Write a protein that binds this ligand. Structure first.
Ligand SMILES: Cc1cc(=O)n(C2CCNCC2)nc1-c1ccccc1
Length: 119
C-alpha cells in the first residue's frame, strides 16, 4: 500500500487525461485500497472537479500529485493530442482545487474535500 486517505494523486482512467484526485475511503467497502478480481491492487479516489466523481483505479494508473506542471512528464510516459475545450475547462477547475489542496495538511484536505454519500 503506497497511498493513504487524503493523499493527492494523478489518476489515468479510460478515455480521460491524467486527472487530479484525492485518495479516499470507498463509501461501501470502508477501505481506500483493495485487491481486485484480477489480483491487482487498486486505490479509491475522488476526482477534483465541479461535479463529484469517484473511482477505483489500478495502482499502475495512480501517481503522487506533486504539482500541476507534472502533467507534461505524465504525457511523456512531435505528435500531440489536442485538448478538447469542454474537458480542458473541467480539468482546469480540478487542478485549481488540487493546487489549493496541496497547500493544506492531510487532515485539512480530508475535512475540506471528503464527499458526503446519501442513500
Ligand atoms: C477523469 C474521470 C475519470 C472517470 O473515470 N470518470 C468516471 C467516474 C465514474 N462516473 C463516470 C465518470 N470521471 C472522470 C471525471 C471527468 C471530469 C470531471 C470529473 C471526473
Amino acid at each position: 500500500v503506497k497511498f493513504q486517505v487524503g493523499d493527492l494523486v494523478w489518476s489515468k482512467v479510460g478515455t480521460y487525461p491524467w486527472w487530479p484526485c484525492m485518495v479516499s475511503s470507498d463509501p461501501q467497502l470502508e477501505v481506500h485500497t483493495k485487491i481486485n478480481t484480477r489480483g491487482a491492487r487498486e486505490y479509491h479516489v475522488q476526482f477534483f472537479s465541479n461535479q463529484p466523481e469517484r473511482a477505483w483505479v489500478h495502482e499502475k494508473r495512480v501517481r503522487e500529485y506533486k504539482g500541476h506542471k507534472q502533467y507534461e512528464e505524465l504525457l511523456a510516459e512531435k505528435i500531440r493530442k489536442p485538448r478538447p475545450q469542454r474537458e480542458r475547462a473541467q480539468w482546469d477547475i480540478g487542478i485549481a482545487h488540487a493546487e489549493k489542496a496541496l497547500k493544506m495538511t492531510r487532515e485539512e484536505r480530508i475535512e475540506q474535500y471528503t464527499f458526503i454519500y446519501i442513500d
